[PDB]
Design an enzyme around this catalytic site. Structure first.
Site, mmCIF file in Angstrom:
data_model
loop_
_atom_site.group_PDB
_atom_site.id
_atom_site.type_symbol
_atom_site.label_atom_id
_atom_site.label_comp_id
_atom_site.label_asym_id
_atom_site.label_seq_id
_atom_site.Cartn_x
_atom_site.Cartn_y
_atom_site.Cartn_z
ATOM 1 N N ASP A 95 1.006 -1.170 0.167
ATOM 2 C CA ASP A 95 -0.100 -0.017 0.069
ATOM 3 C C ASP A 95 0.768 1.317 0.028
ATOM 4 O O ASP A 95 0.369 2.132 0.695
ATOM 5 C CB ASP A 95 -0.952 -0.075 1.214
ATOM 6 N N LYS A 142 2.359 4.855 -0.931
ATOM 7 C CA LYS A 142 1.749 6.107 -1.712
ATOM 8 C C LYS A 142 2.349 7.269 -1.088
ATOM 9 O O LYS A 142 3.092 6.963 -0.035
ATOM 10 C CB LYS A 142 0.183 5.940 -1.228
ATOM 11 N N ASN A 163 2.713 7.637 2.950
ATOM 12 C CA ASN A 163 3.696 6.894 3.472
ATOM 13 C C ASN A 163 4.939 7.368 3.564
ATOM 14 O O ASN A 163 5.629 6.774 4.092
ATOM 15 C CB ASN A 163 3.559 5.350 3.143
ATOM 16 N N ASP A 169 4.669 2.270 7.679
ATOM 17 C CA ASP A 169 3.722 1.008 7.380
ATOM 18 C C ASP A 169 4.286 -0.129 6.600
ATOM 19 O O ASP A 169 3.160 -0.986 6.107
ATOM 20 C CB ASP A 169 2.486 1.572 6.667
ATOM 21 N N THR A 212 -5.513 6.242 -2.798
ATOM 22 C CA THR A 212 -5.341 4.834 -2.716
ATOM 23 C C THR A 212 -5.239 4.242 -4.344
ATOM 24 O O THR A 212 -4.377 3.519 -4.629
ATOM 25 C CB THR A 212 -5.955 3.850 -1.666
#
Length: 457
Positions: free
Chosen positions: A131, A133, A136, A152, A171
């Protein structure tokens, strides 16, 4: 054997996301500051058994990379997990870029090498982000050339993320197509990095659309172009790296390790600049527009979400206070108001809300007050909450209104509402209801009124 509250004290909230809250905590002995992720067990479903989680946690504790957020400790009680790790105060990478006057291919490459180094190290240790992005990507300081730390890594493998739209914003742009279909490995992180790179160099997502589904459709087909006028000003070597990172079949896609060895990286990340640094002016303009649009759609959902919470409170607090009123005199003392506001917080799913009560009670008493009429306290207490919620939304609106016109066009409304998954006809009908003489423009109060009607208020 070990409990969280005996070792740390919450100082302030750093934020909220799909897994829970991130709270700034200080060690009670060493005074060391850190970011603690609080994950509710009842709210967040576990993808793996506790044994598989406890094993990865032990591995993450042993890992160290300058481009990866450090996990210090892990705690667990009846209903929560506590991921204690390093704190960064620089903010999100994209929030810094939007403050720059100039941005070059060197700037983007130095940013992308940092991301790539962290990914390579994590992949060597068989850890996938999935995930990845811009949110992050944290900085140690809000400045150019500042160190990037990825947050994360490995979270996804063990925790099932929040399907709520407020958490789903921003997302779809980054997700690898093989993650959508179910079969994926570490190569999915390269794809996400490639998408970030494309945005750094153009200010536009390669896979774009009106709403989430539309973007996912584009991602899934995997077709994109360098057809934008700003790509004329970008080197062919940068385009060649993107093509390799956005290669559809994961086996045929470049590794994080080999992307570091790519000509563009090795050339543009030189300690002493050996290349031309023209500013990607159109890219920086588009990155500010993209960012502003993202932040406003995020703020709109948070505002609607916090209004569906503030409506519960006004009635529930008057009930609690009424119960506490033995005499029936509609009055209470400072201790009773404190005990009452604490009771209102205990019936929810933030950890810092109980400790924050006393200061808030005294802030209400500063405007109000002895024997305090609870009704006067309640309205004043809820209005302050309403105001703080309105101010947050306003800051976002002002930020999006780049030309300081005070208005947002119907075209901009279509975009904001598309990113926030509000149906076209639904928002258009709310607009007609708010202003009969509407002419394709809303000011801040009309926008706020629209969002109130969109959450039944």
């Amino acid at each position: 054997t070990a409990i969280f509250s005996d070792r740390y004290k919450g100082q302030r909230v750093l934020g909220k996301g799909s897994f829970g809250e991130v709270i700034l905590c200080k060690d009670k002995i060493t005074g060391q500051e850190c970011a603690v992720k609080v994950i509710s067990k009842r709210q967040v479903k576990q993808k793996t058994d506790k044994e598989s989680l406890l094993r990865e946690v032990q591995l993450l504790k042993q890992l160290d990379h300058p481009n990866i957020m450090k996990l210090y400790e892990f705690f667990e009680d009846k209903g929560y997990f506590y991921l204690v790790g390093e704190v960064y105060t620089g903010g999100e990478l994209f929030d810094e870029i939007i403050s720059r006057k100039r941005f070059s291919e060197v700037d983007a490459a130095r940013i992308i090498r940092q991301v790539l180094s962290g990914i390579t190290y994590m992949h060597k240790n068989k850890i996938v982000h999935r995930d990845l992005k811009p949110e992050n990507l944290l900085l140690e300081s809000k400045s150019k050339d500042a160190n990037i730390r990825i947050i994360d890594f490995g979270l996804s493998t063990h925790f099932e993320a929040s399907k709520k739209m407020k958490d789903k914003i921003g997302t779809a742009y980054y997700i690898a197509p093989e993650v959508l279909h179910g079969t994926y490995d570490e190569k999915c992180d390269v794809w996400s990095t490639g998408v970030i790179l494309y945005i750094l160099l153009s200010g536009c997502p390669p896979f774009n659309g009106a709403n989430e589904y539309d973007i996912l459709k584009k991602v899934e087909k995997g077709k994109y172009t360098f057809e934008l006028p700003q790509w004329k000003k970008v080197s062919e070597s940068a385009k060649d790296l993107i093509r390799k990172m956005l290669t559809y079949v994961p086996s045929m896609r470049i590794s994080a390790r080999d992307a570091l060895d790519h000509e563009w990286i090795q050339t543009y990340t030189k300690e002493q600049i050996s290349v031309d640094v023209p500013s990607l002016d159109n890219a920086i303009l588009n990155i500010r527009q993209f960012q502003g649009t993202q932040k406003l759609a995020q703020a709109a959902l948070l505002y609607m979400g916090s209004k569906l919470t503030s409506q519960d409170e006004t009635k529930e607090l008057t009930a609690i206070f009424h119960k506490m009123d033995k005499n029936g005199d509609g009055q209470l003392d400072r201790a009773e108001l404190i005990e009452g506001y604490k009771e209102l917080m205990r019936m929810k799913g933030s950890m810092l809300d109980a400790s924050a009560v006393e200061h808030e009670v005294d802030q209400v008493l500063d405007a109000v007050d002895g024997y305090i009429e609870y009704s006067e306290f309640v309205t004043v207490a809820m209005d302050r909450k309403t105001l703080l919620s309105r101010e947050r939304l306003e800051r976002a609106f002002r930020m999006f209104d780049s030309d300081n016109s005070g208005k947002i066009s119907s075209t901009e409304l279509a975009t904001i509402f598309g990113v926030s998954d509000v149906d076209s006809e639904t928002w258009k009908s709310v607009l007609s209801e708010v202003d009969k003489n509407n002419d394709g423009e809303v000011d801040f109060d009309e926008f706020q009124q629209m969002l109130l009607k969109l959450c039944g208020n």
